Amino acid sequence: AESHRLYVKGKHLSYQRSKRVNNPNVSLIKIEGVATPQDAQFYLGKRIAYVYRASKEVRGSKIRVMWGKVTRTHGNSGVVRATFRNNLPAKTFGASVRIFLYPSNI
């Protein structure tokens, strides 16, 4: 097993926003391979996770996770909306994100 991965690869594009006013409370996400609202429905409800590092080790681990879930589709092009427990950093715009298979309905 060269591969170990059970998530689909995703990007963090943006907060929800108008031209000139943003909303940190929702986050727009680009899910690799997904190209349409139709498609992006599959991942609604699924669990997102932003995984980052830090100096001050907490749980024996210096790796931390921001969790949240995909909530609805966005636009016409497979892009999708997410709430996280705590809104994502914004320095994270263009960072990678992880979209999981649970809660599975397959």
């Binding site: 097993a1 591969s3 170990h4 991965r5 059970l6 498609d39 599959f42 599975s104 397959i106």
Partner: protein
């Protein structure tokens, strides 16, 4: 509400175990389970009373020997069952089959 699960143990280390339905991809493939007892297992059976009982270890063997019997019938079902699932490059789960 949970799913009794088994592996089988001798096939890939997984015990007779509980698992939540919402965290499982049910695949298309299926092995027969007629000749497997599966009666004694219930909530209380798993109810935590460190050190595994000799019952559990035995029940495993009972249940497994039948499943591995049925598994081995079809080619590569055993080997499949031992290998771990993982998304390869450009897997699009949202229209893969399983």
């Amino acid at each position: 509400n949970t799913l009794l699960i088994s592996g089988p143990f001798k096939v890939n280390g997984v015990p007779l175990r509980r698992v939540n339905a919402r965290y499982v991809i049910a695949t298309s493939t299926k092995v027969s389970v007629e000749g497997v007892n599966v009666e004694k297992f219930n909530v209380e059976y798993f109810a935590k009373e460190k050190e595994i009982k000799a019952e559990r270890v035995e029940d495993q063997k009972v249940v497994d020997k039948a499943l591995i019997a049925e598994i081995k019938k079809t080619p590569l079902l055993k080997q499949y069952l031992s290998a771990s699932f993982s998304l390869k490059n450009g897997d699009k789960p949202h229209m893969l089959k399983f």
